[model samples]
Target: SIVIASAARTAVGSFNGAFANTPAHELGATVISAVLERAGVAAGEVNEVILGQVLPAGEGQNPARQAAMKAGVPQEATAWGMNQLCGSGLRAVALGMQQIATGDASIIVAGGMESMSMAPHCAHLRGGVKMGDFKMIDTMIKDGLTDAFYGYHMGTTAENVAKQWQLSRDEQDAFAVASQNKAEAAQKDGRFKDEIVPFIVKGRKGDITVDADEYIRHGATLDSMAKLRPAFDKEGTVTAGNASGLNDGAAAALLMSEAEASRRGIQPLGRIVSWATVGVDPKVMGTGPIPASRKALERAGWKIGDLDLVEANEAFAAQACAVNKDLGWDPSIVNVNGGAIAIGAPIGASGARILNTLLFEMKRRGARKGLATLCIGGGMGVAMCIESL
Candidate 1:
């Protein structure tokens, strides 16, 4: 249950354009490598690797296995790939903790990686080879329910939650502005130094080394964000500025049993105090964190006031605001620096990305407790509570 080291990915720019350059396996491999190097842990020491992959089928048959081999993981190590949409990473981490706590393993690598930009857009069809494109194939005859699991596009669902919560466009825009400001300021202040792993990004001519996040825009303001048009619905509150960006990133964390770390003369950065997942209505699936957060706190024997920082995914400003209200927490302590509104979410990678954010925030505040929580697809919610060393 102890967190030995933590690392988070950058908001890969250009969605389909930039992310297309780096495949999912490459992304996951790079992150795991970076985290292990930063932690000063040898790859052969890892007992297992658990990765959260949302659209694994979109890119390959077994992304986690592919990523593990690419990461140079030892043949003796075991790897598992899981999916919980946006909450996959947290689920992976929770499962790893259970393994260690139950004497199933001692040390493990748990994290998530996602490249939505690479997700393919599959055509909607049924029983192919049906009468050589019968009736001249009226395109309008589409089923409109290809991915019936979620019922609607994620954006539409966010828009519905916005309406139900009465979250206004102006309010959402303002929140986004705040997120950018906080993130920019934090970066300038060197608040992310400890957890960030700098890397070299190759370009057409030479290799460009990047040490800090590249997506934050310091000059973003409510006025500029407010001018953006609605993306989900022309009349809806969700907008490009307020919703999560089409970003690509990866994150990884090292988990080990307390005894193992102590025997190795290593001090844990933090420990998993508690974790929980809950289900809500799929139509408003983004609201899953409301109950999940409550369950996490209940298990941790803590309250909202006891948390020094909260890393809540900004799937949409409406969903974030609604969950905040349900938790009765102070906005000042929640996403104190920024959330997906500014940093972006890489779907599956987001669960671990938020943990990185929370861990740094906890250190900055000199506090002991923090929360990482997310609302996922299929009416699911995930949360993890952490306590600093």
Candidate 2:
């Protein structure tokens, strides 16, 4: 069995928010070091470092290597990066578990980091410009938001799911409102303090502290959300208000073999019981998690009713509602402290960040088991099952 020692994440930052100036590597390093310290594990003990990332057009090669070194991981340690669209971060954790389970390595540092604001604009054709003006490409949208296989924006897929699931605008708005209220209450109660790694941004005016999620709406209402315009189609239910915000942040966890932790005389927060990733139709990729979660639970020999906590990213209100309805999951145990909707979704970082949320919440509630799942772009879902100590 692989034990998860410690996990932490930087506060989710809105687009061009407090962490706009911070690079992806810096964010990764910050949280990586935070988890390592929290686990009382030394950098030298790490066998490898793996980080999940997306929108790396402007970021340096091998973000994991850059972040590992910045976090004081030895040069001798192995480091690599993975791009699984929205599933990147959680996949890193999954891969980390496999490494230890196979007895290949003892300790691993894995997570995800993303900086949407730092994503660079590009001119696809580098050839001599034969035309008057070359088109500037938003790499973020081109690579992260669009389903190249189907040629439709991610939001459109959510709309399609909304239609098939029969999710009404009113129902979606209510979900969004609940997300905001939960996030707002959690933030005020310091419910997230345990999982957050305070980040300091050195700004021109002064240093701004980024210790709380930047996108939470303290007084969200169904009436206010209903007034927003549709983001994808002219006559669609998916609105800007009901979708996850573009964000920037990072999260990481320290993973080790059960024997390793026991030998080191360190207590672990939990263990990764099972993990799964599956492919689905790209047109409605938001529902990918349905099958993935089933596989994860099946592999763990656990039933849906056994889960004490669940953190399913609210990529879109329509999509979230569809997955929740189909899974027959308990709402109170699911996203009790808000989700990507109210907090933000920094794509790559979201998976591990959500797992961090689940882990901390499980501990607070004295919960036994938990699950974290995310719908990936390009038709995939990633999920992980855990058991608290």
Candidate 3:
């Protein structure tokens, strides 16, 4: 079995907020350093590193290798990057598990990093006209927000899910409000402190340390959310208040064979029991998690009722609500510390971030089993089952 020796993440920062000036590699290095320190493992012990990143415009070539070196990993160690949109982070972890299972490596570092704030613009020169009429495209919106196959914005998919699920605007607004309430409660109780590592920013005046999520709206209310206008379709139920925010962040996990962990006297936080990724219709991509979760549970030889907790990513309230309603899960046990609705969703980092949150919370609550799942762009979903150690 593959075990997670440690997990950590930088406090999620809003787009163009605290992490705007910070690059993706720096975020990756920060979390990698923190997770290794927490695991009491030296950087040299890692045999390989895999990092997930969606937008790597300015971050130079081989961002994963750059991050590994920045975090003090030995030059002999190998590193590579993975891109599966929102599923990239978890896919990195899955790759790490495969390596361990195949006896390829004993210890590996895997996770994801993204800086939506720093995504660059592109000007197509190949198809340019002789005149000065040129079109500059925002890569963040063109690649991150718009689906390549469907040629529609992600919000349009959410709106379709809302309509298909027959979810009302009030329902999505209420879910968003509840997410904020839960996030505020978790913040008040310091539930996130254990998983978040402070990221330092060097300003002209002084160095600033960011230790908490910057996007959470503690004072948000249902009335305020309801007052927001639709952001996608004119008559659509989707709204900015009920959807995830574009953000910047990173998260990392240290994994090793269970036997290797025991031999090294390392205490594991959880075991990766099973994982699955599935494809779905791009038009209603929000429903991807439904089939993915079911298949993952089947592979783990467990039933839905056996799960003690579930981390269903809140890419949008309509999507998450539709997933929960379909799964018939107890609301109290799902996303107990809130979700992307309040905590922001840095596309590449959110997959691993959700799992990290689940492991820590499961341990805190003395839970035995937990599940983390997310709907990805390009009509796919990823799901993983974690058993607390």
- The residue-by-residue lDDT of candidate 1 on 64-118, one tens digit each, is 7777777788888888788787898878889888888888887778888876666
lDDT of each: 0.77, 0.92, 0.92
Clashing pairs in model 3, backbone N/Cα/C closer than 3 A: none
Model 3 CA deviation exceeding 4 Å by range: none
| Alpha carbon lDDT at 60, candidate 1 | 67
Q: Between prediction 1 and prediction 2, which has the larger lDDT?
A: 2
- For model 3, residues 256-338, the per-residue Cα lDDT tens digits are 99888888898888999999999999998888899999999999999999999999999999999999999998889999999
Q: Per-residue lDDT for 171 in model 1?
A: 81
TM-score of every model? Answer: 0.90, 0.98, 0.99
Runs of candidate 1 exceeding 4 Å displacement = 8-14, 123-150
Task: Give lDDT for model 1.
Answer: 0.77
